[PDB]
Design an enzyme around this catalytic site. Structure first.
Site, PDB file in Angstrom:
ATOM      1  N   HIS A   1       0.807  -1.183   0.000  1.00 34.72           N
ATOM      2  CA  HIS A   1       0.000   0.000   0.000  1.00 34.72           C
ATOM      3  C   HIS A   1       0.871   1.277   0.000  1.00 34.72           C
ATOM      4  O   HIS A   1       0.494   2.240  -0.659  1.00 34.72           O
ATOM      5  CB  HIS A   1      -1.127  -0.034   1.101  1.00 34.72           C
ATOM      6  CG  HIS A   1      -0.748  -0.589   2.425  1.00 34.72           C
ATOM      7  ND1 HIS A   1      -0.465   0.020   3.639  1.00 34.72           N
ATOM      8  CD2 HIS A   1      -0.765  -1.925   2.697  1.00 34.72           C
ATOM      9  CE1 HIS A   1      -0.238  -0.952   4.528  1.00 34.72           C
ATOM     10  NE2 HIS A   1      -0.358  -2.133   3.971  1.00 34.72           N
TER      11      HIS A   1
ATOM     12  N   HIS B   1       5.958   6.638   6.816  1.00 34.02           N
ATOM     13  CA  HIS B   1       5.545   6.341   5.452  1.00 34.02           C
ATOM     14  C   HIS B   1       4.855   7.577   4.889  1.00 34.02           C
ATOM     15  O   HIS B   1       4.621   8.547   5.604  1.00 34.02           O
ATOM     16  CB  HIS B   1       4.595   5.115   5.412  1.00 34.02           C
ATOM     17  CG  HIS B   1       3.322   5.380   6.182  1.00 34.02           C
ATOM     18  ND1 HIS B   1       3.213   5.146   7.528  1.00 34.02           N
ATOM     19  CD2 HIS B   1       2.151   5.951   5.781  1.00 34.02           C
ATOM     20  CE1 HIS B   1       1.987   5.552   7.903  1.00 34.02           C
ATOM     21  NE2 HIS B   1       1.335   6.067   6.881  1.00 34.02           N
TER      22      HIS B   1
ATOM     23  N   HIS C   1       1.770   9.070   1.865  1.00 38.24           N
ATOM     24  CA  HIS C   1       0.672   8.908   0.942  1.00 38.24           C
ATOM     25  C   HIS C   1       0.849   9.964  -0.148  1.00 38.24           C
ATOM     26  O   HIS C   1       1.259  11.086   0.178  1.00 38.24           O
ATOM     27  CB  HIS C   1      -0.693   9.140   1.634  1.00 38.24           C
ATOM     28  CG  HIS C   1      -0.855   8.264   2.846  1.00 38.24           C
ATOM     29  ND1 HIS C   1      -1.483   7.044   2.814  1.00 38.24           N
ATOM     30  CD2 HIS C   1      -0.418   8.404   4.120  1.00 38.24           C
ATOM     31  CE1 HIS C   1      -1.426   6.510   4.029  1.00 38.24           C
ATOM     32  NE2 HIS C   1      -0.790   7.317   4.855  1.00 38.24           N
TER      33      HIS C   1
ATOM     34  N   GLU D   1      -3.831  13.172   2.702  1.00 35.33           N
ATOM     35  CA  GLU D   1      -4.981  12.608   3.389  1.00 35.33           C
ATOM     36  C   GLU D   1      -5.733  13.717   4.101  1.00 35.33           C
ATOM     37  O   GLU D   1      -6.901  14.015   3.809  1.00 35.33           O
ATOM     38  CB  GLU D   1      -4.541  11.478   4.305  1.00 35.33           C
ATOM     39  CG  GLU D   1      -3.888  10.355   3.518  1.00 35.33           C
ATOM     40  CD  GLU D   1      -4.010   9.026   4.187  1.00 35.33           C
ATOM     41  OE1 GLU D   1      -3.602   8.936   5.368  1.00 35.33           O
ATOM     42  OE2 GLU D   1      -4.501   8.074   3.554  1.00 35.33           O
TER      43      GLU D   1
ATOM     44  N   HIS E   1       3.665  10.540   7.349  1.00 36.00           N
ATOM     45  CA  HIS E   1       3.182  10.120   8.660  1.00 36.00           C
ATOM     46  C   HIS E   1       4.343   9.462   9.416  1.00 36.00           C
ATOM     47  O   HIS E   1       4.832   8.412   9.016  1.00 36.00           O
ATOM     48  CB  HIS E   1       2.061   9.089   8.513  1.00 36.00           C
ATOM     49  CG  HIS E   1       0.808   9.712   7.981  1.00 36.00           C
ATOM     50  ND1 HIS E   1      -0.219   8.984   7.395  1.00 36.00           N
ATOM     51  CD2 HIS E   1       0.463  11.019   7.959  1.00 36.00           C
ATOM     52  CE1 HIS E   1      -1.133   9.876   7.054  1.00 36.00           C
ATOM     53  NE2 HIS E   1      -0.767  11.108   7.380  1.00 36.00           N
TER      54      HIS E   1
HETATM   55 ZN   LIG Z   1      -0.363   7.073   6.810  1.00 38.26          ZN
END
Ligand SMILES: [Zn+2]
EC number: 4.2.1.1
Length: 257
Positions: free
Chosen positions: A61, A91, A93, A103, A116
């Site tokens: 992911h 990690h 996004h 996010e 994050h």
């Molecule tokens: Zn995250």
């Protein structure tokens, strides 16, 4: 199962993970016109001098840069937090386009990506116990915009070819996460959740106001990663973000006027 595809993306997650429709889901939109300054927030303390990175993993992911969390080596304290939270991994996004990827949003603005840094509350002994507690995790969220390069990110960028596909890992020692921070530690905070399944409502979110800048070339390299495993059909790892969720009975507090 779950992912960010055409048939298993965020709007489907509730079927296997019904808390997806819960009371404290993340991310959220941060309305800077309704978040209130909270003079009780204490000063926030990022202590990463002794951090020990170990490995980088493509989990299908995102990719996680993992740390030794068996001692207080890299800890977050202060701010809204009681006690000590140990860094376990970070990690990102990110989007397929520079106009999306984050996010959290700020007044509905989407950033190109979001970092994050995930920490767990040492009072619970290990990460797996911590995620079962409402105050188990503290996640430091940092927005990324495309502009200048971030020199402290380049070591991450350069290892991505070695972890292109799901399940690949590589040694990743001596990485300094201080190189990913903006100048200011001003932040917003609210109680929420993991943004991936199992979506547990265990997170004190601390979202920094100041984005970091990364170059177009750095983000392009993120977008060369794959969701799939080696030997499977190529699906670029892009748009691995969950959209904003209802704030419900929560307030976002600001550390700054
Ligand atoms: Zn995250």
């Amino acid at each position: 199962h779950w992912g960010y595809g055409k048939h298993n993306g965020p709007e489907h997650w509730h079927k296997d993970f019904p808390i997806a429709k819960g009371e404290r889901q993340s991310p959220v939109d941060i309305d800077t016109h309704t978040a209130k300054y909270d003079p009780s927030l204490k000063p926030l303390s990022v202590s990463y001098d002794q951090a020990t990175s170990l490995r980088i993993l493509n989990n299908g992911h995102a990719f996680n840069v993992e740390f030794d969390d068996s001692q207080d080596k890299a800890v977050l304290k202060g701010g809204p937090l009681d006690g000590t939270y140990r860094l376990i991994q970070f990690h990102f996004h990110w989007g397929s386009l520079d106009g999306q990827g984050s996010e959290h949003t700020v007044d509905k603005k989407k950033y190109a990506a979001e970092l994050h840094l995930v920490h767990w509350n040492t009072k619970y002994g290990d990460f797996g116990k911590a995620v079962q507690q409402p105050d188990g995790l503290a996640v430091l969220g940092i927005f990324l915009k495309v502009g200048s390069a971030k020199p402290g990110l380049q070591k991450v960028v350069d290892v991505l070819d070695s972890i292109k596909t799901k399940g690949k890992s590589a040694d990743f020692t001596n990485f300094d996460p201080r190189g990913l921070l903006p100048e200011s530690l001003d932040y917003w905070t609210y109680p929420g959740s993991l943004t991936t399944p199992p979506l547990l409502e265990c997170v004190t979110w601390i979202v920094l106001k100041e984005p970091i800048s990364v170059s177009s070339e750095q983000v392009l390299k993120f977008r060369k990663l794959n969701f799939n495993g080696e030997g499977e059909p190529e699906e670029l790892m892009v748009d691995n973000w969950r959209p904003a969720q209802p704030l419900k009975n929560r307030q976002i507090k600001a550390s700054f006027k």
